[PDB]
Amino acid sequence: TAYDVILAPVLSEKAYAGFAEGKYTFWVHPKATKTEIKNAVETAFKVKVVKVNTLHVRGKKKRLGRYLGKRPDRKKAIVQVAPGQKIEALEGLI
Amino acid sequence: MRKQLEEARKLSPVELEKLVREKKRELMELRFQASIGQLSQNHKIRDLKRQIARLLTVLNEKRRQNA
Amino acid sequence: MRVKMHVKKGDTVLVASGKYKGRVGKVKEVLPKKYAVIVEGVNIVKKAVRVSPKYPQGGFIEKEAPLHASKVRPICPACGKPTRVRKKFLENGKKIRVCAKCGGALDTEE
RNA sequence: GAGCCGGUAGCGGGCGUGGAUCCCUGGAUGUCCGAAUGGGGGAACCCGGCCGGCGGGAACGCCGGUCACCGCGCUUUUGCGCGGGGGGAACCUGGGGAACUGAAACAUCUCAGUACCCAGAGGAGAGGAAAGAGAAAUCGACUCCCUGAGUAGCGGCGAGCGAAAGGGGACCAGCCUAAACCGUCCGGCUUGUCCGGGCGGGGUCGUGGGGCCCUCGGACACCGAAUCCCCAGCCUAGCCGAAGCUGUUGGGAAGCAGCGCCAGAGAGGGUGAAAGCCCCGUAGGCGAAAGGUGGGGGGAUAGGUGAGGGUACCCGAGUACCCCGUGGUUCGUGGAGCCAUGGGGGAAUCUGGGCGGACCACCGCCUAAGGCUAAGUACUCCGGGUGACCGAUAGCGCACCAGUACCGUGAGGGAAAGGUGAAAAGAACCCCGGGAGGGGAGUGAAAUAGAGCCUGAAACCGUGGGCUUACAAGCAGUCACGGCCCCGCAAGGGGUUGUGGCGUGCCUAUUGAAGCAUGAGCCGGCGACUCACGGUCGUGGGCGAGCUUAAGCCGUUGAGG
RNA sequence: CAUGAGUAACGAUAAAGAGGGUGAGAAUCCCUCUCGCCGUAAGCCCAAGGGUUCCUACGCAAUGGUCGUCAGCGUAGGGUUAGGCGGGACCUAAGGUGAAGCCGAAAGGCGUAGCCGAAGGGCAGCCGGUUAAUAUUCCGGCCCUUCCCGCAGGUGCGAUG
RNA sequence: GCACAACCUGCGGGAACCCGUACCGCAAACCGACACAGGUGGGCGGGUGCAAGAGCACUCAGGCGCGCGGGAGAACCCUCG
């Protein structure tokens, strides 16, 4: 309770280009306030929170032998930089 | 790391505070890892979580003792 | 054959079997006594995978089932297992004693 | 005690004899919904006001601690400090309370105070020390069982309905408060001498209590948890613990055989086909803990009980009682009593007042219009165990991703599917093929044991073989015989039929059926005269006086007395 | 598990024919070429309601009323982000709730006030460009919105009665 | 309270969260248990011609070709001359 962390980067393709020049996209604690995004963002990666937007998605179509389901809840949020800093290794990475 | 049980015993306010906080960050590191080293990681994840968990068990014990 | 058991890594005899030739019990569960005597398996003529040689057919088949094995063997083979008399301060020593005796002392051999 | 990262075994990585898996008891956050209560709201999601915090400060926004409502008592000012509420399979109290069907109609009546809506206390409440019984100069709380008679009786006296004291049994504490009088006291009003409310002695058990006079009196009684300490019963973890191997037919043996074995423990299951001596911490007996629960046995804690006469009396309920309007009760309107209340009347302090006999004269009875609770019968969610209780269409419907699939708007309804094998060794590999799937190799004891895969029949469709069939009119058939073919030693026995004789199919309800009356699609599994008492007649059996409920007791077998 | 039955039927008389292609196989997929029927709809569009799916990639034993190398089918992965669009962060009627209050054997009946409660009120942006896929949400050009800190200038300012 | 730090007004600075789009969507994805010719709300409804016009006939864009095919084509019901 108060363990700041609240996310998992958007290893997502399309989301790549943004990482590429100025914005970055990730999966975030389905719940964090957008200002929550700004803070986790800022103190976490020592940056400059710019433009913080959000989207959400649940799962559809998972057949399980004799019964079925479709998954849980994956949350999406995108935040941009001010200069183009931080996330380096992450980005060079994927 | 029963030994860690010990360190635990050892620290207090702001201490345990930033300890568990930073450690937590560490596990974040893990979260990140969700697609890199991985293999020997496993444990950093499960155990690390158990560890920090303890961290909390303690804070509770101590400040609880308090108020 | 329950939450409780017989010998462990141990080294014992096969009565009603096909081998009898006792030996290393590589592993033994807690509930299904499931124990492997490394005394009779097969090949599972493997996947056809490169998992086993790209030209496969697994070798060490050894899941030991039946429980007619005569666990424990001191200078004596088929014997049940005793318990204790403690003898020393805090002494469980559920070693195995009957006729001959064996307790699997933490030394020279299991 | 030495292995585990739940059901997934697989991947990819691990923790642990410096008690790791895990069994238990108490621990910590303990998301959002749900009584919800800080506010709202189509719940499980959006809002807000106070102190703390961090960040880019202010605005933003999270952790956080935060803030209904109720009535309840306390300082009228804490509105501080409590209570409840919200549940719950059945049992339970009261609240309110119905047609069927019976009475072969049916309006009294009946099912019944039953079903159901409700409110609510529990772990069980219910009732629970007598204005009782009952008539003997008798009993003695309340509750539940057997019996009391299904008589006493209630009634279109009709269908029907139907007690109570006693006796047998079980379980056996009894205890209290306003009850002006005491005095005390504070408030009173208004002052003297009324009421109000606190302390008490009084604080009625089967009758006194108070105030005056005298005899008084100087250690055994515990609660309904008064209360505390314990052996705390258990909770779930515990522990031991009896004796065989050789052989041998077998894929097997625990089996046939040989000899050797145990037993205060031949209850059972489990170990490749049926073990006391192999698996099982079981019957043998014993085991055990610092938590969560108490009856016992005893202590202490013990509020509070526990004397005698005398004397002008004042001191348990605001309505007893009587008129009608009604409930109870074995009572349905009646000669109809007692308790109980809706209307109007409308009082007695132990010469008191209801009660036995509508009522009147008697004796007798009990002591009313307040309070508390244990203990013996009920109930079944949940645990344990046993079953001339069930086997996968019976069992809970439900034996395991069935209260879910799926129909309905909601209310609501409400399936199916259990097993491969002994163990996975469950199928490398070669061959037709897009694939499935098909022939081989290996499996193996079998794979006509091969993945919906045990046992795996009937129905129906199929491949081959035997007899049979194109001038034939018949449920069917079937008696006869002749031609085929079959096992055959013959006797002859099989199946097959062409010729001919004679032949209206079965069930139900019918005076009456072939039915053109009907039932009938075909196979398979389900599918319907019982149980409890009363009785009643028989008749198989014990004594003529014969037999024993409710219970107390002994009880692997639990043995019957 | 049979039976009419391999007859009745394929959901509209808005017709289709070719060539080449890909394929284990293509009347029934892909391009392209001839051709008919819509067109006032068989248009697009917002909304509702559906809630997967949409896309991209493999696959077809089930499913389409046969096809089927096609799919809204199966397997996997990725896909919608907005101070200024919408709705709440505001308003309210009918209308529900309901502190008060009146009222029932009980459960409730009625209910001002305040609240909840609407494509009815009110409010600050548009267009051109970019993804397999979303846009006035992304990018860009252009045009604003309130609220907070300040400062600068200006005032009886200061409810929501 | 204000009034010396309340409101009206410029410039600078700084802020602005919650839930929403995919696509179907006069319809094989919404309602009829079916890829059921039924129904289901508002937005010009391109054009020619017709006196007028969302009706008419051919078309614009844009949308198709209903999803089982080939075949001779006699009875006869259908539809129509």
From Swiss-Prot, chain A:
GO terms for cellular component: ribonucleoprotein complex; ribosome. Keywords: Ribonucleoprotein, Ribosomal protein, RNA-binding, rRNA-binding. The keyword Ribonucleoprotein applies. One of its GO terms (biological process) is translation. Gene3D superfamilies: 3.30.70.330. Pfam families: Ribosomal_L23 (PF00276). It comes from the Bacteria. One of its GO terms (molecular function) is structural constituent of ribosome. Transmembrane segments: none annotated. InterPro entries: Nucleotide-bd_a/b_plait_sf (IPR012677), Ribosomal_uL23-like (IPR013025), Ribosomal_uL23/eL15/eS24_sf (IPR012678). SUPFAM superfamilies: Ribosomal proteins S24e, L23 and L15e (SSF54189). One of the early assembly proteins it binds 23S rRNA. One of the proteins that surrounds the polypeptide exit tunnel on the outside of the ribosome. Forms the main docking site for trigger factor binding to the ribosome. Part of the 50S ribosomal subunit. Contacts protein L29, and trigger factor when it is bound to the ribosome. Belongs to the universal ribosomal protein uL23 family. This is Large ribosomal subunit protein uL23. The gene is rplW.
Swiss-Prot record, chain B:
GO terms for molecular function: structural constituent of ribosome. The keyword Amino-acid biosynthesis does not apply. The keyword Transferase does not apply. One of its GO terms (biological process) is translation. Keywords: Ribonucleoprotein, Ribosomal protein. Pfam families: Ribosomal_L29. One of its GO terms (cellular component) is cytosolic large ribosomal subunit. InterPro entries: Ribosomal_protein_uL29, Ribosomal_uL29, Ribosomal_uL29_CS, Ribosomal_uL29_sf. Belongs to the universal ribosomal protein uL29 family. This is Large ribosomal subunit protein uL29. It comes from Thermus thermophilus.
Swiss-Prot record, chain C:
NCBIfam families: rplX_bact. Signal peptide: none annotated. One of two assembly initiator proteins, it binds directly to the 5'-end of the 23S rRNA, where it nucleates assembly of the 50S subunit. Keywords: Ribonucleoprotein, Ribosomal protein, RNA-binding, rRNA-binding. One of its GO terms (biological process) is translation. Part of the 50S ribosomal subunit. The keyword Lyase does not apply. The lineage of its organism: Bacteria, Thermotogati, Deinococcota, Deinococci, Thermales. SMART domains: KOW. One of its GO terms (cellular component) is ribosome. This is Large ribosomal subunit protein uL24. InterPro entries: KOW, Rib_uL2_dom2, Ribosomal_uL24, Ribosomal_uL24_CS, Ribosomal_uL24_KOW, Translation_prot_SH3-like_sf.
